[PDB]
Amino acid sequence: AVPISVPRYKHVKFVVYNVYMAGRQLCSKRYREFAILHQNLKREFANFTFPRLPGKWPFSLSEQQLDARRRGLEEYLEKVCSIRVIGESDIMQEFLSES
Incomplete structure (x- = not known):
């Protein structure tokens, strides 16, 4: 339900997945x-x-x-981020940021 999306993957050698919330890249x-x-979320919210997870x-x-x-x-994040205590957890908020 929350507008979390993963509209792209990108080759960079490995692949990255670009995560957005309401059209803003996180x-x-x-x-x-x-x-x-x-693994971190499941241990914290067991x-x-x-x-x-895929x-x-x-x-290859x-x-x-x-x-x-x-x-x-994207489907995984749509589910877990739509649960407030998980989507707003320190673990998820750290994940959804740039270093």
């Missing part, structure tokens, strides 16, 4: 940083049944599969 993060985010694959990802991972990360 951060640019690689997949492993999302994986760490999920009484919640978290949605599945997973790893036994092969094509352009189409990077787009699918982007969509999956």
Whole structure:
């Protein structure tokens, strides 16, 4: 429900995912940083049944599969950020920022 989006991935050598809230860019993060985010959030909020973070694959990802991972990360964030205590947590607010 909250207007969190991941409208792009970018090759930079690895891939980053560009996260926006209400059309404002908040951060640019690689997949492993999302994986760490999920582990941190789940430990902090373990009484919640978290949605599945998009997973790893036994092969390198094509352009189409990077787009699918982007969509999956957006769907994940749409769910967890729409829960106030999780979306406003120190963990999430740190994640959604630039160094």
